[PDB]
Write a protein that binds this ligand. Structure first.
Ligand SMILES: NC(=O)c1ccc[n+]([C@@H]2O[C@H](COP(=O)([O-])OP(=O)(O)OC[C@H]3O[C@@H](n4cnc5c(N)ncnc54)[C@H](O)[C@@H]3O)[C@@H](O)[C@H]2O)c1
Ligand SMILES: NC(=O)c1ccc[n+]([C@@H]2O[C@H](COP(=O)([O-])OP(=O)(O)OC[C@H]3O[C@@H](n4cnc5c(N)ncnc54)[C@H](O)[C@@H]3O)[C@@H](O)[C@H]2O)c1
Ligand SMILES: NC(=O)c1ccc[n+]([C@@H]2O[C@H](COP(=O)([O-])OP(=O)(O)OC[C@H]3O[C@@H](n4cnc5c(N)ncnc54)[C@H](O)[C@@H]3O)[C@@H](O)[C@H]2O)c1
Ligand SMILES: NC(=O)c1ccc[n+]([C@@H]2O[C@H](COP(=O)([O-])OP(=O)(O)OC[C@H]3O[C@@H](n4cnc5c(N)ncnc54)[C@H](O)[C@@H]3O)[C@@H](O)[C@H]2O)c1
Lengths: 261, 261, 261, 261
């Protein structure tokens, strides 16, 4: 669809499953060279790799924990060594777990902040460092959430991590705009991925979530991959520092439908 | 680029010049059927019509003042009568003029509110009324500005009209999301159109505006048309109620570059 | 409570009932001189006047329709003629009525825009014109709503009017900040006033609204008057261009409590 | 000024200097019992303690590093042991240092995130845990910055920490609103404190900062303490989850004055 993506090198963290996997496949379909990332389970990575070969794409899988600095540095260097360059960096790895805020341990809080926010900072830092030192007008796409805007009781660490990601992205976008480096956030609503399989399995829970989505349906991973592909393309040449929400209307305050209140 | 746009009927208000004209040409290139709109004479409309024929597109021009209810109703009906249906409604007509707020006449205030806000409401209302009565999952795209967010001294009427447009769009998006009708805003920054030709003609004024754009350059109309085409396509199927800023970073607070403050 | 408010002249539009009335009484208690405004029913005005005399305050009532330019001009001039000066202008008059957006008449749309937005512009314009011509560091407080942020199906005209008010206020705040003129918005959530008496009368409707308020209760007019008094005082000397929401948490997305979604 | 603050117990982190010190003195003047906090030595704390005695207030100083969990837990317990209860928790400690984002070490990033964000989480958690277990309708005030909204090149860690603080505060506000616990942010612009003494010492730097403030002057600590006192009082009974900016108009986009752009 986007001719300018052909030959571009795209790195995606946490891309052995869910949204990361869907984006890896979409970029492969756009003829971009993809670097998949797995934390520990290499088998899941080989799976995404087979889907990519299925569409005639070219890709490699690199092990790396985004909370380990040397792993992030190595991930970026691996892309350059294998494909000769780096064009798009997508920080997608993340985690979440529910705990009442006043009962949340420092350990749980740090795990989420370290992975969701600091991990994205490291990925962004390494990609931009490369872009700057080589005069490349690359782009960084950070995977956020409707929760960088919508508060989330029981997930205060997650909400804080995404709210922080918003300001990190806007700051990097402003700081490097003069060099032609675009930095944007994608803010997905409820999407059908493994992180929600069990929740969406229960008919009561599923109906509950759907009631919070104005459009009435839980989105598919491909609907988010479509956003990532567009933002990475030259079609979005004048777009930087934004958060593009793809949430079926979640951020519009679903409880106020029908003129309630 | 977007195969799903082929055969879609797109109506664009104030499309005989500037952004409206560029969008008309882009949609024609996507093989959509376009309805161009001019306020009084049709010479400016003939240029766009010729540009559309040049790319093998199909289009018609309809006279209509967006501040006149019957004109807006007729504009929508003309699309249906000529092409048999309506798929995308783009409210783009607008005007602006500088006046110190405490010296602004009610006449100037009303002219801008009537055209920029009420005109968009009328266009949105008529398109949605049609979509609802015919079970069509159409879309409405409203042309806003970075000024639905960035205050604008000397243009208080314009800022108010776009701030109002933001809430109008988000309300319509929430209200009709259950019916599959998407409503979104595009927020352009400084773009090279006739409304800025004189301003950008002066080397001092041009450099002044460029200093307020982090990316360092004034955008081209095609960069905004690219956004409209994507938002109208099924690629943005899960996107509704948002304002997609295409401003080279204007909303990121340009005065804070280099860690100032 | 605020010693600096003693002797200040405060004008409040639509202050014969509800929030306007409560603010009139609160300012009288702060020893400010108040100018009450009624559109037609003078009897309601005399009532507020009696409450003010009850607290030993000084006030006058002036007839005026905020949609009539000469009435707004006269309202401001009356304050100056009676008390010799003007210090605080509060644009509070407003109206709302539910109608599905695609069925809303231009007449209903205009009535709300004219009263809620244009009326506030006129009041703001006249107050600021006076402040500027007399080197007075006055303040303007505009009564908004959580709906300058929260979309409102069935009330698209109201939402647009408040969204417009937000940008109008921020623009005026930026434009006149150098002259020491502060302009701020107050954004009330659901408050117990006559405009909601019937709605809150029904046990089912009342419980429905309360479910949308995190704090669990519908606010009282005095809780909003407290905000107005503080914003008008020198305690808020460095505060301008903001919208202070007093909504029990409505803008925090009530549907997401308990980690839902 | 606020009679309801008499006898209330207020804990303020990092209150031996700057804004924390000013707030400690203001609350003492409101007859509240204050718990001052210093990181290592206590000389700076003794100054505040003497200022508090000067106004006839009652206070104690407690050593504590907000990045050390046991220190935060002890700080809260010390207030309860000394004064018998806790009513207001103010997380004010913070730090910042400039470094180009692509050159920022993980060490610098973590130091700021740990202190500014995680430290505030710990303070909020301990205060709320106490409030919940004792059915106390207490309040938490978190010291943010205009930079939870305005991006800040060279201070990406600071911006991320405050953006994260915004979502943390809004989440806690929503989560505990049903229990009557209010949680709000104060967002100061440029204020005259020791953290800016050197910067504001230079005539060129000072004039540079003032040019980014619409009101034209750098705020004083007392102007921020005024906001904290009001938010803690019952006057703000219906206010929760907001960020009250006290910035002289900084968030209004200063570069757009005079209708530029
Ligand atoms: N699924 C949704 O509805 C939804 C909504 C909003 C935001 N998101 C965000 O989108 C991203 C993708 O989520 P998803 O649904 O595909 O979830 P997912 O769990 O399937 O994908 C996240 C991936 O991150 C990897 N990962 C976690 N910690 C890592 C670490 N330290 N190092 C390396 N890899 C690590 C996981 O192994 C996993 O494959 C996440 O950042 C998530 O917060 C998802
Ligand atoms: N050019 C920019 O930099 C910029 C930035 C932000 C927003 N916008 C918005 O984008 C839209 C397009 O602006 P543009 O630059 O192409 O300006 P433009 O003046 O070239 O286009 C606006 C068109 O609206 C038409 N129009 C005005 N009033 C009308 C009425 N009552 N009925 C019918 N047609 C009417 C005009 O004749 C004109 O062709 C406007 O809404 C504008 O506010 C433009
Ligand atoms: N009550 C709430 O819950 C709530 C929530 C958000 C916002 N508000 C806003 O606060 C303001 C006060 O609302 P309220 O609850 O006291 O309602 P209200 O109806 O009691 O007060 C509004 C007043 O405006 C007057 N008014 C209307 N049109 C006028 C005109 N053209 N000229 C002069 N006066 C006119 C009315 O006569 C009335 O006394 C309104 O702007 C409203 O939109 C109220
Ligand atoms: N001064 C401003 O213009 C301005 C603008 C926006 C925000 N703020 C914020 O307001 C707060 C107050 O800033 P300030 O100007 O008074 O600065 P400051 O440096 O004078 O005060 C911060 C205090 O935090 C203490 N502190 C730092 N790390 C600590 C730790 N780990 N444990 C305990 N105490 C620690 C410091 O010793 C210091 O006394 C900060 O959070 C700052 O980010 C200040």
């Amino acid at each position: 669809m986007y001719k300018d993506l052909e030959g571009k090198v795209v790195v995606i963290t946490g891309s052995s499953t869910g949204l990361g996997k869907s984006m890896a496949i979409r970029f492969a379909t756009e003829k971009a060279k993809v670097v998949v990332n797995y934390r520990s389970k290499e088998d899941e990575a080989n799976s995404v790799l087979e889907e990519i070969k299925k569409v005639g794409g070219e890709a490699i899988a690199v092990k790396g924990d985004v909370t380990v600095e040397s792993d992030v540095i190595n991930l970026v260097q691996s892309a350059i060594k294998e494909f000769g360059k780096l064009d798009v960096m997508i920080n997608n790895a993340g985690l979440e777990n529910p705990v009442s805020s006043h009962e949340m341990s420092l350990s749980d809080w740090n795990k989420v902040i370290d992975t969701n926010l600091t991990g994205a900072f490291l990925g962004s830092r390494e990609a931009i460092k490369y872009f700057v030192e080589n005069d490349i007008k690359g782009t960084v796409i950070n995977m956020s959430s409707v929760h960088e805007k919508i508060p989330w009781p029981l997930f205060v660490h997650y909400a804080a991590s995404k709210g922080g990601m918003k300001l990190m992205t806007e700051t990097l976008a402003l700081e490097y705009a003069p060099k032609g480096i675009r930095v944007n956030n994608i803010g997905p609503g409820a999407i059908n991925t493994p992180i929600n399989a069990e929740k969406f399995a229960d008919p009561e829970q599923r109906a509950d979530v759907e009631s919070m989505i104005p459009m009435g349906y839980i989105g598919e991973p491909e609907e988010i991959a479509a956003v990532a592909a567009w933002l990475a393309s030259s079609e979005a040449s004048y777009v930087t520092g934004i958060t593009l929400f793809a949430d079926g209307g979640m951020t519009l305050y679903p409880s106020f439908q029908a003129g309630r209140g």
